[PDB]
Design a protein around this ligand. Sequence first.
Ligand code: CLA
Ligand code: CLA
Ligand code: CLA
Ligand code: CLA
Ligand code: CLA
Ligand SMILES: CCCCCCCCCCCCCCCC(=O)OC[C@H](COP(=O)(O)OC[C@@H](O)CO)OC(=O)CCCCCCCCCCCCCCC
Ligand SMILES: CC1=C(/C=C/C(C)=C/C=C/C(C)=C/C=C/C=C(C)/C=C/C=C(C)/C=C/C2=C(C)CCCC2(C)C)C(C)(C)CCC1
Ligand SMILES: CC1=C(/C=C/C(C)=C/C=C/C(C)=C/C=C/C=C(C)/C=C/C=C(C)/C=C/C2=C(C)CCCC2(C)C)C(C)(C)CCC1
Ligand SMILES: CC1=C(/C=C/C(C)=C/C=C/C(C)=C/C=C/C=C(C)/C=C/C=C(C)/C=C/C2=C(C)CCCC2(C)C)C(C)(C)CCC1
Ligand SMILES: [Cl-]
Ligand SMILES: [Cl-]
Ligand SMILES: [Fe+3]
Lengths: 333, 81, 33, 33, 340, 447, 137
Amino acid sequence: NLWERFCNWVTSTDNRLYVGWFGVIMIPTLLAATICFVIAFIAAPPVDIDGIREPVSGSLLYGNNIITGAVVPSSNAIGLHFYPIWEAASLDEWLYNGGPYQLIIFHFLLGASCYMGRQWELSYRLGMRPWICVAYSAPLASAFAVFLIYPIGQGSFSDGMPLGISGTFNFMIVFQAEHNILMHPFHQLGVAGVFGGALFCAMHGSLVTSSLIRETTETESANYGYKFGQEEETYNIVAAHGYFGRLIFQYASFNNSRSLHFFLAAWPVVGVWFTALGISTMAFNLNGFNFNHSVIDAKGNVINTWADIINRANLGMEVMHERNAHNFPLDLA
Amino acid sequence: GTTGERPFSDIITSVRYWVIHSITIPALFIAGWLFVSTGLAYDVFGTPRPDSYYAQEQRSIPLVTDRFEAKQQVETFLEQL
Amino acid sequence: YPIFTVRWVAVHTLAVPTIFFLGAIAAMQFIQR
Amino acid sequence: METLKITVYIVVTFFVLLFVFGFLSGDPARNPK
Amino acid sequence: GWFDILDDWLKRDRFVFVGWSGILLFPCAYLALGGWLTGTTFVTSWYTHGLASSYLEGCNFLTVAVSTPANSMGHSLLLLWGPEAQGDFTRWCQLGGLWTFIALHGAFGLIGFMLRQFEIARLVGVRPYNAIAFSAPIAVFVSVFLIYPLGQSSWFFAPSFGVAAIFRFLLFFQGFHNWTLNPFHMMGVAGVLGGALLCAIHGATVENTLFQDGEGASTFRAFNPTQAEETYSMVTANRFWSQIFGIAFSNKRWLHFFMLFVPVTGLWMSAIGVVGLALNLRSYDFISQEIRAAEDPEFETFYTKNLLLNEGIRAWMAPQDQPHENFVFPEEVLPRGNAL
Amino acid sequence: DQESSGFAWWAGNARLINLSGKLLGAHVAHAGLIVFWAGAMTLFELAHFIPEKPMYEQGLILIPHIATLGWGVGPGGEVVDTFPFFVVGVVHLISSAVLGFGGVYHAIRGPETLEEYSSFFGYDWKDKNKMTTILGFHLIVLGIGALLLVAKAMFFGGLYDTWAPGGGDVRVITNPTLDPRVIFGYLLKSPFGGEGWIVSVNNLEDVVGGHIWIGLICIAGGIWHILTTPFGWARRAFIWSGEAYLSYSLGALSMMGFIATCFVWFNNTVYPSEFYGPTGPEASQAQAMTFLIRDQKLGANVGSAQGPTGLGKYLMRSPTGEIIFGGETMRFWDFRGPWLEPLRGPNGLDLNKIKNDIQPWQERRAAEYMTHAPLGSLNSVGGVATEINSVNFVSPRSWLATSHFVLAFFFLVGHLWHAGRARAAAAGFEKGIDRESEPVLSMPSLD
Amino acid sequence: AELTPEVLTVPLNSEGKTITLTEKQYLEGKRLFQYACASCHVGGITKTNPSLDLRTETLALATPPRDNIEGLVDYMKNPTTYDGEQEIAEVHPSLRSADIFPKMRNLTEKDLVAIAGHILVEPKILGDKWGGGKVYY
Ligand code: CLA
Ligand code: CLA
Ligand code: CLA
Ligand code: CLA
Ligand code: CLA
Ligand SMILES: CCCCCCCCCCCCCCCC(=O)OC[C@H](COP(=O)(O)OC[C@@H](O)CO)OC(=O)CCCCCCCCCCCCCCC
Ligand SMILES: CC1=C(/C=C/C(C)=C/C=C/C(C)=C/C=C/C=C(C)/C=C/C=C(C)/C=C/C2=C(C)CCCC2(C)C)C(C)(C)CCC1
Ligand SMILES: CC1=C(/C=C/C(C)=C/C=C/C(C)=C/C=C/C=C(C)/C=C/C=C(C)/C=C/C2=C(C)CCCC2(C)C)C(C)(C)CCC1
Ligand SMILES: CC1=C(/C=C/C(C)=C/C=C/C(C)=C/C=C/C=C(C)/C=C/C=C(C)/C=C/C2=C(C)CCCC2(C)C)C(C)(C)CCC1
Ligand SMILES: [Cl-]
Ligand SMILES: [Cl-]
Ligand SMILES: [Fe+3]
């Protein structure tokens, strides 16, 4: 059958890159988002992100370098409305209002969601256990948080994270002004997740490199002591555990490789999950702890803490973000 | 293997331990309490009491201005209370 | 088994003040301005 | 514009139909054991 | 000999190894940790900063800090017996003496810990790459807590030891140094986040390429630390990532060294850039952009928006974050957009 | 013990997979916990309820559900008698004891397996007939429950209707919408802005009608699954095991949880703002209204007032031309609410109605909703992050929206977890790779 | 610094008589002010109309004078515009409009003296911060 040949090739394990059914969506959507991103980063004209007819330049050809360049998010006048090309009277209007942003982020989110599914899929075709895709769900959820979830709760794709280095920082700063995310325990767990992951990654790598079993001379790389697919382990887990158990105390060390590797997966993934959830729940304006004026003296004078110093800085971001867009005294959008 | 001390399991399980420590853990805990309830923690460390941050008509913060007569500057602040 | 060891000292320099500090922090909840 | 809208709708339909019909064409059986 | 007798006792196999490095490590670490705990519970910041900062004053775990000494102390070591406290424990606390106490005993503790990793590595029989990797934490601590304030006017502008105090430090560095724009911090982000990534992805790969060595559905039991065979399949994990991502590890030794390299390299890059910020040698601007924007009021990028935010931070937080400056900004000089 | 089943203590409920009596026990025991919380939470809310305060200034999420169903409230949402709240809690609480008693009995006392005790309650996961039959029964239960809502709306007091003329009130629903072009038209609208998918349902008729429809759809499908076995294409497209079915429902419970989030965030019909506080878009629109009324009273001509950007300060147009509120609230112009629709003409906000027809109760409503926007800190300080302590408030909408996004996200993770494992258990490598038959070692090399 | 009898002494009427509130009395007004008022009046500003604050200076130039206990009680009974020309109970909570403003129903005469007492006392404690807005946060 001809459809069975197609299905046999879509699902082949002999392809240099695995395609698969998730890939039948992934490949076109990612290619579309990638091509449009490259073109808009170089060439897009200014975009009126805040919907106040004050366009924001973001591309290289319009006076940006790699650091200041962005694909600018679509207009605040658009809000959450869907805005493909065909909804616009002309390419010129589409570029002015932020069209490439929606095109890119929606194709990308679709493409990365299917990337996750592709990971389950090839793993199933290979006889593997299936949960690598669960780990990749932590950055995917984070991407979902800042491109889709946070716009939904706020009410405009214009509050999505710009596709750009400086645009990203403009997102972090305005976010802290509005939601106090440093004082939110879900971002703190994210910090604990990436710092801890960095630490543990550093740790595991130094401990295994430390226990490598002598197989080479000095005039060559220790790496040539491992050959792709040997059945013998290349380091000495017992020596590494002997070392690290003495560094702290023995029961604070791992003697089970599977138990240690599970810990390596779980610590950053969980912490990133929570920090995705922190962006996703601050989207609905459940904000970080507010301790402003929390400590008071017996007369009633405010006794500042460091929280009140954080507030003075938050205030200064607040009254300067979107400096022309507010006509009324409360920041409700 | 095992290094040689008595396992912590057998210790918090043994009756002798909790004979000793049902007195000691509460004692220190009560000790800590009294350190704050007597007001000693305020004077040992110099931390102001809720009525010792300002004088009754002052909103200026007693900031140390001089490096070397600083010890005396803090005490000139406490006197104005 | 011996009773006092290097570990013994180590657990008690952390633990004795911990319980003491928790006591002091306990009473602080009842301070009214 | 409308020609583009129809062009993309056809493209999207095509791939979505590859996906549903591909995953119905006996996926569980495609494994090594 | 007595030295060989003391060496015998220091290097005894106990529950908590001591070693020669212990004579430095334990008292300094214990005093750094004890000093932080002591101050966050009892010690104010009313005379150094105008801040409350202890459990005893009303602060919670997120707002307690051992705060930095007032700007007027300069870079004084602030020793207890030194000239500022003159042996008065009460006044030393009120002057910020716990800050240097912690930072200095902490600095020496970190030396002791790195010596500890050396000492244990030599006794046990392994290469000393764990201590090498710990250079990055030390480089970070030295640059941020010692060099950076030594570059500035005083220990005051070092980070105060506290959760929210650290957050303020982060925000000071955005408003004043535009630290996000510095490529040395960017390289640190990429080594921290790239380390998290390698940690997560290598753990998942091993757990999802295991061989079947037991019959239990919880697969942990199927490992014995004395076993000789690899517990997961490098061949299968290679094919998977080759076909998913394009490239895959094929050398287990290079893979684990790479896990050392990345986050160690990145912390060292962020230290370098902090060393630059000690001197206010910032990546604050791009000159080309400022020349365009000064001549063209319709030019607006995300770079120029961030600078408006930095200017708002500085004017709105400086009167209380830098109280030794006696700053008084009348309302009309404060930068602010419409309405807010 | 783990040596008997394979699963460890932290995965101990996986030992229940082929023990239908104990598995029934845990399930019935869990359902008691839900019903317990529902009753317990209600009485807590009632013990703390104050009638003079609005419900949303008091941290209530259940009493709002009960009042929307028409029990306890009078005109405009005012609570007139609290005894129906009391009943709902007591009855749930009393029922949970029943559900608990049976759940515990089946768990540790009843027969561990049902398959030898009775051929009707017993089930084998791989038996596609018995599974569709159990599915069918439960579909029938779901249909009945959806009709109970119809019956409460049509035959038993009605529902609270924020849109009712003269101001919202309890109202009996006489003409549910049955027109499939409306009911299934919701299922075909876009999820994006100004459309809303099913979240845009803005009248009780459409609500009551859709439930008549799924009420009938469910009972029919229930009968259909009791009478049929799965076709051949479904047989080869699915995984037939207990974990597999658990994963299918995790995905579904996830999809539903996301949908619930959007519903309570945007919709003010089945979530009456009278009870739940204004929505996000609403409070922002209410802010613009409040300042329009105030400035106009001072003598401003809100149609021709130009704002700093050049756009109108009080009034601008939408991208399709509609007269909308100006300022940054321009993003919220899809908002619809009973306090604002009187000022809506066919072209949008009617400048003449703004000038002459604003009523005091509208100015009161706009001010109330502006100063109760769903914005607050984790410790329930009300406002933007830069707000000083004073107002103890977080909108129920925030609390309900954030929790159910967390639950939804984790259940999607749950779906990915159990789905992949189900697939690997069925294929026979969920425990790792056979050394003596490694699949990759028999495929050819990529290069 | 203490909440002294000197601090808790505010004008009673407009003819110079005074009233000395207790600490308990002041704490009552602060709790009642947060229950009924803070939604619009947090910190002495006015969210729904920033042009009119709760500062003692502003209340003094109001008509009738609102910088003593009498007029604030009167205002909470029958509020008017800044020149006393329009009665505004229809849009401002009061005892007269407790039917449409329910949080004013359960307020006794003692509760109105406390709330007024808190409005006059707080600027004495916090100075320019009362009514100053986010510049003084
Ligand atoms: C994606 C976000 C992101 C990421 C990944 C990073 C990553 C990093 N930032 Mg940056 N940063 C960000 C955003 C981010 N930042 C933003 C938006 C800003 C605002 C502009 C800042 C502002 C900022 C500042 C101000 C600083 C950093 C620094 C750093 C580095 C800190 C590394 C570290 O572990 O220090 C942690 C500290 C150490 C490892 C020192 C050693 C500590 C010892 C080992 C601890 C031992 C404890 C002991 C056992 C007892 C503890 C007990 C107690 C808990 C009870 C790292 C490269 C720092 C830097 O560059 O330093 C060189 C720095 O000072 N960032
Ligand atoms: C909602 C939670 C929930 C529920 C309903 C169940 C239910 C069950 N679990 Mg699971 N389990 C859970 C959570 C839950 N588990 C969690 C969180 C963990 C991790 C710690 C485990 C770990 C776990 C393991 C490791 C095992 C089970 C097993 C079981 C089954 C037998 C338990 C047993 O032998 O108890 C014996 C215990 C007792 C007899 C003590 C008394 C327990 C009862 C229920 C107390 C009830 C109190 C209540 C107030 C009484 C109400 C009275 C009424 C009149 C109102 C049972 C069906 C077992 C199994 O599968 O066996 C084949 C098994 O091996 N569970
Ligand atoms: C969806 C559920 C839900 C929601 C939306 C609310 C919402 C609300 N509740 Mg209620 N409540 C709930 C469940 C819920 N509750 C449950 C399950 C209980 C039983 C314990 C209660 C018991 C309860 C009481 C007793 C009270 C409330 C009250 C409140 C209000 C204040 C909440 C607050 O301050 O929390 C504080 C915030 C937290 C405690 C943060 C918790 C964060 C969680 C732990 C994160 C969990 C993440 C994830 C699930 C963990 C697993 C991760 C892993 C898989 C990797 C608010 C209106 C109060 C009120 O005002 O009543 C009038 C009140 O007094 N609730
Ligand atoms: C989903 C719930 C459920 C299920 C599937 C079962 C299934 C079973 N139970 Mg169990 N049981 C349950 C709940 C359940 N029970 C509850 C809640 C209790 C506590 C009241 C008990 C108490 C109990 C006892 C004491 C015994 C069983 C036994 C049995 C077995 C024989 C039942 C029989 O022949 O009934 C035949 C049918 C009937 C008797 C008519 C039932 C009419 C129902 C109750 C009308 C109401 C229906 C309505 C939809 C309920 C709404 C509930 C609400 C929460 C929404 C069977 C395996 C027996 C057993 O296994 O002995 C070895 C046994 O001794 N059950
Ligand atoms: C809880 C509800 C439920 C469940 C779990 C099942 C489960 C099952 N049904 Mg039953 N069924 C139900 C309710 C349910 N049914 C009801 C209420 C009815 C009456 C209308 C039916 C009518 C019905 C029929 C007529 C058939 C089944 C069959 C089946 C089996 C295959 C399902 C399948 O392939 O779906 C997968 C779904 C598809 C392949 C559809 C194509 C893809 C769609 C378009 C995806 C759209 C999703 C997207 C996100 C949009 C969602 C929102 C909105 C726009 C729609 C399976 C055992 C089949 C069987 O074998 O019966 C013997 C069968 O022929 N069911
Ligand atoms: C049971 C609770 C689950 C909590 C969420 C899941 C935690 C682990 C998820 C990490 C996925 C990583 C990517 C693949 C990782 C991967 O491949 O895992 C592999 C590893 C081993 O798998 P096995 O096949 O042996 O076991 C899984 C099943 O087959 C059961 O046998 O899985 C586990 O051990 C799961 C442990 C469950 C118990 C988890 C409890 C830990 C969380 C405790 C709560 C923390 C809260 C913190 C609050 C601040
Ligand atoms: C300073 C100084 C010194 C020192 C002293 C010391 C050394 C001290 C120590 C102290 C200490 C040593 C203290 C301790 C403390 C502790 C604490 C205070 C704790 C607490 C805890 C808690 C609270 C817990 C919590 C938690 C966690 C974390 C986990 C889970 C969750 C929970 C929540 C449970 C000297 C005199 C020599 C000299 C001079 C200076
Ligand atoms: C299986 C199992 C389990 C579980 C269990 C469960 C989950 C159970 C449940 C249980 C339940 C679920 C129970 C319930 C109960 C209830 C009750 C017991 C109630 C009672 C009530 C009453 C008596 C009422 C009273 C009243 C009235 C009448 C009115 C108002 C007031 C009052 C409240 C007084 C666990 C996990 C442990 C583990 C082991 C195994
Ligand atoms: C009540 C109500 C209503 C209505 C509702 C309705 C009428 C609904 C319907 C609904 C529906 C009617 C739904 C359905 C859905 C569906 C789904 C959700 C699907 C799923 C699917 C799947 C899951 C599949 C999968 C797959 C593929 C894709 C391929 C091959 C393989 C498999 C089979 C796995 C309204 C809105 C009016 C108003 C309100 C109330
Ligand atoms: Cl901005
Ligand atoms: Cl605005
Ligand atoms: Fe490894």
